[PDB]
Amino acid sequence: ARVTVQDAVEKIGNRFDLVLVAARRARQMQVGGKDPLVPEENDKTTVIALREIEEGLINNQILDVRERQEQQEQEAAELQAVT
Amino acid sequence: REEAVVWDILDEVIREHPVLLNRAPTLHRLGIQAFEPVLIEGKAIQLHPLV
Amino acid sequence: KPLVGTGMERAVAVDSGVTAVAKRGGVVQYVDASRIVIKVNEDEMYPGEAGIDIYNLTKYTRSNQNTCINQMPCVSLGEPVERGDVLADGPSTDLGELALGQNMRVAFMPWNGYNFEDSILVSERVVQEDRFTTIHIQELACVSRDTKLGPEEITADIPNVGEAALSKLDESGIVYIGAEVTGGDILVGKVTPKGETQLTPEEKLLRAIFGEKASDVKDSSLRVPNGVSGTVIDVQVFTRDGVEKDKRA
Amino acid sequence: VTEFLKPRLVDIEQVSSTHAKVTLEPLERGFGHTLGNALRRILLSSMPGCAVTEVEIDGVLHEYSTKEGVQEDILEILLNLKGLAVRVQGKDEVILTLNKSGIGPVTAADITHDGDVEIVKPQHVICHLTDENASISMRIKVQRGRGYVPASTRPIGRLLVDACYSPVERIAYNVEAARVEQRTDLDKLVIEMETNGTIDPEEAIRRAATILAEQLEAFV
Amino acid sequence: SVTEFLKPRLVDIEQVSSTHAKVTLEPLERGFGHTLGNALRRILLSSMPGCAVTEVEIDGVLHEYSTKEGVQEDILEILLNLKGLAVRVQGKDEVILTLNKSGIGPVTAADITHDGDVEIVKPQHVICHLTDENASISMRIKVQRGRGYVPASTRGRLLVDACYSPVERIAYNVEAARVEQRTDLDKLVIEMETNGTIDPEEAIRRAATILAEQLEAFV
Amino acid sequence: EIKELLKLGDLPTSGQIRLYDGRTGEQFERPVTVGYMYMLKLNHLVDDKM
Amino acid sequence: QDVVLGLYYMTRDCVNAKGEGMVLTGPKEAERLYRSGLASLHARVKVRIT
């Protein structure tokens, strides 16, 4: 479970960008295709996203790089079946 | 009908779903704050003494 | 009977029209839970009519705040009474003294924070003895308005519900007196010939093809408000002239 | 450290039919208060009783009405029966029956004897009658139970009365000094319990100790 | 069908280094959590078989308000260190130990003479420090088997409060539990911390054994 | 006069008795005030508010 | 209201109480003493603190 978010805010010293990036991660985990990068402990996607930011393996930039790589893979594989 | 299986579903979903408690005359921003629900038998909100 | 009063309890109780004060003194003759009979003394008896007083107590009836006004006798058979004496004490009265609530052993001390700001910690004994149990009488009414598309009927035949929901209702579509109804049940099942539309592009034909009979029978109901349980203590039906009051009526 | 002494029952000063005074002796330092408090909690909390549960009066539909000839309201009768004291021995449930006619109080003694069930307070007034032509024929259902069981948590004639399965009503314990066995600093415990008469104090103490031992059996 | 209650089970025992633990019992009957917790707490911190130092005498001390030349710790500090000195002894009730040492450095507990069946559970316990090489410390401690806590105020010999009971700190916390249908239940969570002579679970089991044995005349 | 009425019975004159705790069985220091205050039940029930 | 009263009652000193003046090795045995009732909650003592 979670009580605070002070570590995550310490890692992202904005307190608002944290909400947006955590929301994006939770959305990616709920639609979702992707899977948690931290051992899930029977927690909803919000707590998982916040803990996963706490570990320091995701912020806005890392998530943007991952999305760019996923779009590149889609462009490539979709192209291979086309041409 | 309030079967015996719905309560387990409610427990599963209430886990990490903060709710906002907001007294009537919300003078200042602290008048509304979020807490993680805990299932209580009764009809009255149990609010932490400090707040 | 509040232990620490002010002596004004008796005046308030007797003056307010809740207790059945004795108009003329005498000797009680027959006192059951719903009637008191007083044999007027020889001195006070008027010359002529004889002429012994009868007091009809008002049993459980609704009040303006959904509270029960209950008068119960406080005298035993063969007990003399005087003019201005109290025979029956109404709600929240005791032997002619106004007793709004109860009194119980109280101890002023902080107890683990369960009485933090002004909260009160109650022992389960208070609940067990049922000394704060209060009877609330709630009135629910269903109307049969002479609306378009035909009138409304209070028959027991209702769609979209099996006999399980009709168990409490009698043959006339009204609940029995004394039924232990609960929240979400049906009290007075009324179904309106004022229901739903006529056949449109074989609506009924297609319903018959499917297997279900959707008719003009549209289910209204008088259902207890959700989460409210209790007992039905009375049912009163009012009918205008020339309407052929039903069997329950 | 020659190991602790084992407390054992030494006396039962049965002051009255209702409330008695049990004595436990000996007890080492601290054990007196501990055992007394534990037994008080167990006794007050859980002890089988025989409180009335259901009442079926012939001419009554619901508890909010009156019967001609009965001085008290029906709900008053149900409350008085809630106050009733009863002891059964061989059955989990029994259906007592009451039939009375004529002017005078309807005491619990008017309940049919049914020798297997003993009414511990024959003088308990249930209701009054007014005229000789008024009769009461009410079936009372009594069953074994524990703790407090409200009517809500559990035909139209039946009236449900809240159960009060708790024979005990007041437990008080004080630890005293007993200069016994030519040794000092040994405490004697007295458990003055006031029940409604539907349980023997020795049985109550033994059952309380049995419950506490069973609970402790988790990690012994 | 009216006597059996919800028999508690040790659902989980999470712990910290062997001197500390936390035992969770669930599900207990309504209000049974408090009685079990109180009984176990009282038995554990009031009367538990154990032994510890009771009286110590210095070579050159005759009042508790005294001092020794060449020791950083005064009399009160060294008495305190001896107070928590965990000791385990065999069937012998009372045994006297001797301590002699000189040499700049801490006076660890393990440096006490190892003769006899007395077992010391914390070898690195600090008893006293000394600064001067010429100065020396010579001590004899008395450990006896007792039945709880005996403050020295109860009546060259200096007394020390005898902390016989193994448990250092014990406290219980009653929390609300849940079952399929019933809701007003209790969950006893015993938080125990011993001095290291015995494991916390062993201490709880011995306390339960004592309390059950006290009831052999009833069950 | 309140003190006199207390003293007529076997009750303490100061109005405060010594109360033992129900749970832990230990005494409360600073004896507390105990008595029979007349309390009411107001017509504001939770189920009428929930 | 109640937490503050509790702490104020806890952290206070009277001239003399049960077990005044004894020296304690730490808070843990201080709690052990108080629960066992050997020394009152408010008793001037000497404690080893870390």
Curated annotation (Swiss-Prot), chain A:
GO BP terms in the entry: DNA-templated transcription
- Keyword terms of this UniProt record: DNA-directed RNA polymerase, Nucleotidyltransferase, Transcription, Transferase
Q: Which reaction does it catalyse?
A: RNA(n) + a ribonucleoside 5'-triphosphate = RNA(n+1) + diphosphate
**The keyword Transferase is annotated on this UniProt entry:** yes
User: Which stretches are transmembrane?
Assistant: none
Enzyme nomenclature, EC number: 2.7.7.6
Keyword presence, Calcium: no
Name of the molecule in the record:
DNA-directed RNA polymerase subunit omega
Kindly state the subunit structure of this protein.
The RNAP catalytic core consists of 2 alpha, 1 beta, 1 beta' and 1 omega subunit. When a sigma factor is associated with the core the holoenzyme is formed, which can initiate transcription.
Q: Which gene encodes it?
A: rpoZ
Classification via SUPFAM superfamilies: RPB6/omega subunit-like (SSF63562)
Which family does the record assign?
Belongs to the RNA polymerase subunit omega family.
Q: What class of enzyme is it?
A: transferase
Q: Name the source organism.
A: Escherichia coli O157:H7
What does the record give under GO molecular function? DNA binding; DNA-directed RNA polymerase activity
Tell me, what does this protein do in biology? Promotes RNA polymerase assembly. Latches the N- and C-terminal regions of the beta' subunit thereby facilitating its interaction with the beta and alpha subunits.
Q: SMART domains from the xrefs?
A: RNA_pol_Rpb6 (SM01409)
Its Gene Ontology cellular component terms are: DNA-directed RNA polymerase complex
UniProtKB/Swiss-Prot annotation, chain C:
Transmembrane ranges?
Answer: none
Q: Where is the signal peptide?
A: none
Domain of life, source organism: Bacteria
Please describe what this protein does. DNA-dependent RNA polymerase catalyzes the transcription of DNA into RNA using the four ribonucleoside triphosphates as substrates.
Q: How does it assemble?
A: The RNAP catalytic core consists of 2 alpha, 1 beta, 1 beta' and 1 omega subunit. When a sigma factor is associated with the core the holoenzyme is formed, which can initiate transcription.
- Family assignment from sequence similarity: Belongs to the RNA polymerase beta chain family.
User: What is this protein called in UniProt?
Assistant: DNA-directed RNA polymerase subunit beta
Organism listed in the record: Escherichia coli O157:H7
Give the shown range, full length included: 697 to 945 of 1342
Curated annotation (Swiss-Prot), chain E:
Mind listing the GO biological process terms from this record?
A: DNA-templated transcription
From the UniProt entry, list the residue stretches annotated as the region Alpha N-terminal domain (alpha-NTD).
Answer: 1-219
**Entry EC no(s):** 2.7.7.6
Annotated catalysed reactions: RNA(n) + a ribonucleoside 5'-triphosphate = RNA(n+1) + diphosphate
| Keywords, alphabetical | DNA-directed RNA polymerase, Nucleotidyltransferase, Transcription, Transferase
Keyword flag Nucleotidyltransferase: yes
Its top-level enzyme class, in one word, is transferase
One annotated Gene Ontology cellular component of this protein = DNA-directed RNA polymerase complex
Q: Name one GO molecular function term.
A: DNA-directed RNA polymerase activity
Keyword Amino-acid biosynthesis on entry = no
Q: Which family does it belong to?
A: Belongs to the RNA polymerase alpha chain family.
Role played: DNA-dependent RNA polymerase catalyzes the transcription of DNA into RNA using the four ribonucleoside triphosphates as substrates.
Please give the record's comment on domains.
Answer: The N-terminal domain is essential for RNAP assembly and basal transcription, whereas the C-terminal domain is involved in interaction with transcriptional regulators and with upstream promoter elements.
Per UniProt, subunit arrangement is: Homodimer. The RNAP catalytic core consists of 2 alpha, 1 beta, 1 beta' and 1 omega subunit. When a sigma factor is associated with the core the holoenzyme is formed, which can initiate transcription.
**Name of this protein:** DNA-directed RNA polymerase subunit alpha
What is the originating organism of this protein?
Answer: Escherichia coli O157:H7
Q: What taxonomic classification does the UniProt entry list for its organism? A: Bacteria, Pseudomonadati, Pseudomonadota, Gammaproteobacteria, Enterobacterales
The protein's gene is named rpoA
UniProtKB/Swiss-Prot annotation, chain F:
According to the UniProt entry, which residues carry N6-acetyllysine?
7
This chain's function reads: DNA-dependent RNA polymerase catalyzes the transcription of DNA into RNA using the four ribonucleoside triphosphates as substrates.
Question: What quaternary structure, including any partners, is listed in this protein's UniProt entry?
Answer: The RNAP catalytic core consists of 2 alpha, 1 beta, 1 beta' and 1 omega subunit. When a sigma factor is associated with the core the holoenzyme is formed, which can initiate transcription.
The text of the family note is: Belongs to the RNA polymerase beta chain family.
Entry protein name: DNA-directed RNA polymerase subunit beta
* Species whose genome carries this gene: Escherichia coli O157:H7
UniProt lineage: Bacteria, Pseudomonadati, Pseudomonadota, Gammaproteobacteria, Enterobacterales
